[PDB]
Write a protein that binds this ligand. Structure first.
Ligand SMILES: NCCCO[C@H]1O[C@H](CO)[C@@H](O)[C@H](O)[C@@H]1n1cc(-c2ccccc2)nn1
Ligand SMILES: [Ca+2]
Ligand SMILES: [Ca+2]
Ligand SMILES: [Ca+2]
Length: 132
């Protein structure tokens, strides 16, 4: 019994997978659903640090499951949870700036950026671990 499928990274009771290909934000959501997972929704500061380190180290621009599609300037996670005030620190300086209408959040450098949802980027899926 192992807590995560092969190639998935265990962290604090959940399993994470960073793609080796790029898709747009909606196709990224689908990709995660297809493996019984979810375009990553971040619930803790420790989790955000963990994900940002890997995005920074890999130098990969990476979708997270966060958007202000439904109402501009109101960011919501894909599980419906609202973006809490304790998460505003992570936006890069000058972001979110919605330049050219940017409605999907990404790991970019040391923090978060809003970018065009049609852009192809890597993505991270999250599902819970088995117990063993
Ligand atoms: N992972 C992306 C790394 C590059 O980040 C820059 O370009 C992104 C793509 O556009 C923007 O979404 C970012 O906000 C950022 N940017 C552009 C701009 C800008 C301001 C005025 C005119 C043109 C661009 N101001 N700040
Ligand atoms: Ca919009
Ligand atoms: Ca926006
Ligand atoms: Ca931006």
């Amino acid at each position: 019994c192992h807590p995560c499928p092969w190639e998935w990274t265990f962290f604090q009771g959940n399993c994470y997978f960073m793609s080796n290909s790029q898709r747009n934000w909606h196709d990224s959501i689908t990709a995660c659903k297809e493996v019984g997972a979810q375009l990553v929704v971040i619930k803790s500061a420790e989790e955000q640090n963990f994900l940002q380190l890997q995005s920074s180290r890999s130098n990969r621009f990476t979708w997270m499951g966060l958007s202000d599609l439904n109402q501009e300037g109101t960011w919501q996670w894909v599980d419906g949870s609202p973006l809490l005030p304790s998460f505003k620190q992570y936006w890069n300086r000058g972001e979110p700036n919605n330049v050219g209408e940017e409605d999907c959040a990404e790991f970019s450098g040391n923090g978060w950026n809003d970018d065009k949802c049609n852009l192809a980027k890597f993505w991270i899926c999250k599902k819970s671990a088995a117990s063993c």
